Amino acid sequence: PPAQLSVHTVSWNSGHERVPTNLEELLGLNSGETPDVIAVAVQGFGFQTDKPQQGPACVKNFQSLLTSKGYTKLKNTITETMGLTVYCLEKHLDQNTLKNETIIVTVDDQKKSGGIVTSFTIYNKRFSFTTSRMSDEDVTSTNTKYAYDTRLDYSKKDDPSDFLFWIGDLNVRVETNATHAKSLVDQNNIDGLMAFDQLKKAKEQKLFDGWTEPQVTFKPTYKFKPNTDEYDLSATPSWTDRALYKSGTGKTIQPLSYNSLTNYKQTEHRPVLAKFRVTL
């Protein structure tokens, strides 16, 4: 059992986008890094029914990439609007203690909103990865629009998880007009634009309680004109894909890196990659 392990998370509100070409860049592997755990989350349209017959390409692309690197896919789960895959280096895995388990929680009759939680145990320490999806119009357990539900929060449990990450588009946005928001972006005033971000409001309403976001240094990841770097000012530029972290048992988690991946310009949102170090 090592003292520390590293985790990479990536999420993307990808819509109808297929898997892109350079996957090492997407998962933060393009500089020789060997993370112990990798988690990939999507939000979009039509995953489960797979009309585009895309799912077999996803498999081939992610197996080509990760099998030789020593990773085992612990779980892939898709719904019509969400996707969550967790990988872990094979060497850390004990079949007798893994206790690999996934839940899906949907809140609407159409099964478009709610979340996925995948959890697993290595070195007697339990990880949970959550992704979630909420739409503005939804009727919710919190009476807010935010993609939080206590059933997706494995810190609120009597045998809580050791290491938890929540990744995906939290339906948290910037609460100011677009004109002002674009002007703060042009001034590189990231912190001044962040003052209007809703995550702090959600936390006031006791949502995402005790969950932490790494310092944000990058410009809003949404809403872009596809295949350009131009904001479509029909929405207030915002931070849609986020990465949050927490321990349910007092463990130390340290963010190493948190960044948008602006080379992936194909749709209205940009992917977000985070890298962490956890102490067992």
Is residue 169 near ligand HEM by the rule CB under 6 A?
no
Q: Strands across the sheet with 82-89, in order?
A: 71-78, 82-89, 37-44, 4-15, 272-279, 253-260
- Tell me if residue 7 falls in helix, strand or coil: strand
59 sits near ligand HEM (criterion: CB under 6 A)? yes
- Among residues 25, 29, 54, 233, which is the contact residue for ligand HEM, using CB under 6 A? 54
User: In the range 71-100, which residues lie near ligand HEM by CB under 6 A?
Assistant: 73, 76, 78, 83, 85
Query: Does residue 241 touch ligand HEM according to CB under 6 A?
Result: no
Residues 6+ apart with CB under 8 A from 106: 79, 112, 113, 114
Residue placing its CB nearer to ligand HEM in the complex, 42 or 199: 42
First to last CA, the chain: 9
**What single-letter amino acid sits at 276?**
F
Shortest Cβ 275–ligand HEM spacing (Å): 17
Within 25-44, which residues bind ligand HEM (CB under 6 A)?
Answer: 40, 42, 44
Give the residue closest to ligand HEM by C-beta.
Answer: 55
Confirm or reject binding of residue 192 to ligand HEM (CB under 6 A): no
Let me know how long the chain is. 280
Q: According to the annotation, is 58 in a ligand binding site?
A: yes
How many other CB atoms sit within 10 Å of the CB of residue 136? 7
Distance (Å, whole) CA 101 – CA 249? 19
CA distance 51 to 49: 6
Query: In sequence order, what are the residues at sequence separation of 6 or more whose Cβ sits closer than 8 angstroms to the Cβ of residue 149?
Result: 105, 107, 114, 115, 132, 140, 141, 142
> Should residue 245 be labelled a site residue for ligand HEM when binding is judged by CB under 6 A?
no
Which one among 39, 47, 199, 278 touches ligand HEM, defined by CB under 6 A?
47
> 57 or 195: whose CB is closer to ligand HEM?
57
Given phi > 0 = left and psi -120 to 50 = alpha, else beta, which region is 171?
A: left
For position 7 contacting ligand HEM by CB under 6 A, the verdict is: no
| CB of 58 vs ligand HEM, minimal distance in Å | 3
Stretch that binds ligand HEM, among 8-16, 128-136, 160-168, 225-233 (CB under 6 A): 8-16
Per-residue b or e along 16-39, where b marks 16 or more CB atoms closer than 10 Å to that residue's CB: ebebbeebebbbbbeeeeebbbbb
Of the ranges 13-21, 121-129, 149-157, 196-204, which one interacts with ligand HEM (CB under 6 A)?
A: 13-21
Our finding on whether 12 is near ligand HEM (CB under 6 A) is yes
Would you list which residues are annotated within the binding site for heme? 58
Summarize as ranges the residues that interact with ligand HEM (CB under 6 A). 12, 14, 16-20, 40, 42, 44, 46-47, 50, 52, 54-55, 58-59, 62-63, 73, 76, 78, 83, 85
